[PDB]
Each structure stands twice: as structure tokens, then as C-alpha cells.
């Protein structure tokens, strides 16, 4: 099967390859790599020889591919996806960008959760599959048990989003900022007896000095947070706080009867793991004993973390999760407001499940058919 990869050198594109190499995905497909900067040059060899690089903007070149997995982003998809369809391409388009997520002809992929919805589409046309928003898919990879059973009346989400979400450049800024802040009070920290409030004062001035590296975020992220992600919408939500409902239901396939979901999406200085604090409103007071099972059983990556202090500290943090496909969820307890009020805190790598993993898995699926 002739599959082209686009935007594969990018940040997501890279995790995508690492994983395809790990799962030997390259053993069931004839790969063709795409670039926009220097066609003709040899192509990467992750294991097998894949010839040269091809023109990612060449509609004619793509027409000869059965599959296209692009992590090249929206601006690319907007031009090339259309051009490719109208030119009669009936092949499979596996995209990471949000562009086609809300299109009728496109299925948002997250099999662990919606394998059903995917297979229907596979046999019944559907050639355009898009991955879901980093926040939503990690959320579902944790609360998959409850949702799949329509057990949820509504959910309130307050997030702790990693910088990776914004782009590679932002991660760099985050660590530069952390650097710039230590640099300001480096010595004073050494002297175990300096003035704590003086250390603070400086740190504050620094983050405040225009010379603080904020070209990518606009304001400081390290040592602060930004209670707004993406563009403002008509009502009060941001497109980030919005992709929540619309996209979540689409997957759950329940748009004319959708579970209410809203909350505040905040950026915190974490590298690549999104974290969420959910106020889950269930419909029927269910024993926590059973919520854990439904949850724990939904898929092989969600991991329930005993609501015990010490272990939660080791286990439910960006620190532990980053880089892994594990999706911890803990602090599971009924809340001060009724036994149909379930509290839950989850951590998840945004580059894997929140972006790349679904894509490669989807391929393996479409193949098993």
C-alpha cells in the first residue's frame, strides 16, 4: 500500500515516526515521504529504503498514493486537501490538523473509544480521518468508561495545558524563561541565607522586564499561567474551551443529544503533558467502587491511581507521564455535592495520545481491512 507521510519532520511528525518505527508500521506499507523545501534529496530510512522526497504540493504526485498521513498542519491541508479531492482522489487522508475535524465527510479518530464509528465509515466510503484536539482525546482516554455508557450528565473541565500544545517554539520559550528566572537570582539561592522576599522581588521584576523572552507567548508562562488558549468566540468560550463539547460528542456520536461540556483551558509551564481537573456530573449515584472498574476497564492505557497522597504524587503528574502512552486518572472520589458528583484529575501526554498515536493506529486499522 502506497502511503505518503507529510509534515513528518515537524514536532508531531517526529513522534509519529518514532512510534511507527516502534510498532513496525513501516512493514505493511510502501512509504513515500513528502517535503516542501528540497525535493529530490534522498528520503529518510527508518528501516527500509523509501527512495527520494516528493513534492508535498504536487497534486499529481499524491494521486498515486492510497494513503496520506500529514502532520503538516492546517495551512497545508486547506490548500492541498481540497485540490486533491476534486482532482478525483478517493484515497485515505489521515490528518492531524484541526482543519477537517468538523467536516461532515470526516471521522474524528480515537478507536480505543470509538472503534465502532470508525469501521462503519471505513466500509461506507469515508476517506478523511482527523485526529482530535489534544485535550479532548486525553480526557476521553481516561473517562472512556463512563462516557461510552452515557453515564455522564455533564462535565466541567479546568485544564493545565503543556506548552508543547502551542508548538515546538513555545516549549523552547518556556525553558528559556525558566533559565532567565534562575539567572536573575542564581547566586542569592546559593547563599542559603539570602532574603527570600528579595529573591522574589527580582524574579518578579525579571519576568516583568521587557527583555523577558515572550515572543511566542506574549506574556510570561514560566512562574505564571495564561487563562486563555486560542481565539475568542461569540459566547464566552475560547476555541480551545469550545473544541471540548463539539469534538467530544462527535466522537461519542451524539450531536442531536450531546453531553454538556465546558470549562477553562489554561496554559501552565509544563512541557508536553496536559492535565485536567474534572467536575463529572453522573446521572445515577454509582458506587465509586464501580466507577473505578468501568474506568479502569475501558482501555489498556488508562491507569487508575489510588486516591492516596504519596502515590498520587509520584504517579499523577506531568513528571511521571511525559513521554509515556500511559493515561493516569486519580483523585477519584464523590464530591461535597451529592453522590452523583464525581471528582477526577487526569494527566496525559499530548504528543502521543493527544496528537500522533491516533494517526498511526488508524492506519493499522484501515489496513486490517
Which sequence spans correspond to the domains of the chain?
1-133+351-369, 134-350
What whole-number distance in Å separates Cα of residue 355 and Cα of residue 273? 11
Which of 54, 71, 274, 298 is the catalytic position? Answer: 274
Annotated resolution, angstroms: 2.8
Positions at the binding site for NADP(+): 9-12, 36-37, 72, 164-165, 192, 350
What does the angle CA 272 – CA 274 – CA 275 come to, to the nearest 5 degrees?
140
Top-tier CATH class for 134-350: alpha beta
* Buried-exposed string 70-101: b where 16+ CB fall within 10 A, e elsewhere: bbbbeebbeebbeebeeeebebbbbbbbbbbb
What whole-number distance in Å separates Cα of residue 334 and Cα of residue 344? 9
For cell 525558566, the residue is 178
What whole-number distance in Å separates Cα of residue 332 and Cα of residue 342? 7
Positions at the binding site for substrate: 161, 240, 267
Q: Is 120 a catalytic residue?
A: no
Which of 54, 71, 134, 273 is the catalytic position? Answer: 134
Element spanning 168, H or E: helix 168-190
Positions at the binding site: 9-12, 36-37, 72, 101, 161, 164-165, 192, 240, 243, 267, 350
User: For residue 128, how many C-alpha atoms fall within 13 Å in the half-sphere facing its CB?
Assistant: 16
Q: How far is CA 55 from CA 17, 87, 216, 250, 290, in A?
A: 19, 17, 30, 33, 53
Q: Is 298 a catalytic residue?
A: no
Q: What is the DSSP letter of 195?
A: -
The verdict on domain 1-133+351-369 having CATH code 3.40.50.1100 is: no
Amino acid at each position: 500500500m502506497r502511503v505518503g507521510l507529510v509534515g513528518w519532520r515537524g514536532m508531531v511528525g517526529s513522534v509519529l515516526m518514532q512510534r511507527m518505527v516502534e510498532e513496525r508500521d513501516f512493514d505493511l506499507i510502501e512509504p513515500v515521504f513528502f517535503s516542501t523545501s528540497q525535493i529530490g534529496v534522498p528520503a529518510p530510512n527508518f528501516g527500509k529504503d523509501a527512495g527520494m522526497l516528493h513534492d508535498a504540493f504536487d497534486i499529481e504526485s499524491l494521486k498515486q498514493l492510497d494513503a496520506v498521513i500529514t502532520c503538516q498542519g492546517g495551512s497545508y491541508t486547506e490548500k492541498v486537501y481540497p485540490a486533491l479531492r476534486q482532482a478525483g482522489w478517493k484515497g485515505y487522508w489521515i490528518d492531524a490538523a484541526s482543519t477537517l475535524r468538523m467536516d461532515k465527510e470526516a471521522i474524528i479518530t480515537l478507536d480505543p473509544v470509538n472503534l465502532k464509528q470508525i469501521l462503519h465509515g471505513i466500509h461506507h466510503g469515508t476517506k478523511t480521518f482527523v485526529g482530535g484536539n489534544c485535550t479532548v482525546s486525553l480526557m476521553l482516554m481516561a473517562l472512556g468508561g463512563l462516557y461510552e455508557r452515557g453515564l455522564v450528565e455533564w462535565m466541567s473541565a479546568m485544564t493545565y495545558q503543556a506548552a508543547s500544545g502551542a508548538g515546538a517554539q513555545n516549549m523552547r520559550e518556556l525553558i528559556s524563561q525558566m533559565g532567565v528566572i534562575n539567572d536573575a537570582v542564581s547566586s542569592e539561592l546559593a547563599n542559603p541565607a539570602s532574603s527570600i522576599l528579595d529573591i522574589d522581588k527580582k524574579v518578579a521584576e525579571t519576568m516583568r522586564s521587557g527583555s523577558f523572552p515572550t515572543d511566542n507567548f506574549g506574556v510570561p508562562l514560566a512562574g505564571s499561567l495564561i487563562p486563555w488558549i486560542d481565539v475568542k468566540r461569540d459566547n464566552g468560550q475560547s476555541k480551545e474551551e469550545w473544541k471540548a463539547g463539539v469534538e467530544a460528542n462527535k466522537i461519542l456520536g451524539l450531536q442531536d443529544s450531546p453531553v454538556p461540556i465546558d470549562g477553562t483551558c489554561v496554559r501552565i509551564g509544563a512541557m508536553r503533558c496536559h492535565s485536567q481537573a474534572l467536575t463529572i456530573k453522573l446521572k445515577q449515584n454509582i458506587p465509586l467502587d464501580e466507577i473505578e472498574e468501568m474506568i479502569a476497564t475501558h482501555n489498556d492505557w488508562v491507569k487508575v491511581i489510588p486516591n492516596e497522597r504519596d502515590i498520587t504524587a509520584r504517579e499523577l503528574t506531568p513528571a511521571k507521564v511525559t513521554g509515556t502512552l500511559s493515561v493516569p486518572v486519580g483523585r477519584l472520589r464523590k464530591m461535597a455535592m451529592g453522590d452523583d458528583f464525581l471528582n477526577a484529575f487526569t494527566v496525559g501526554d499530548q504528543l502521543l495520545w493527544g496528537a500522533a498515536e491516533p494517526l498511526r493506529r488508524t492506519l493499522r486499522i484501515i489496513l486490517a481491512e
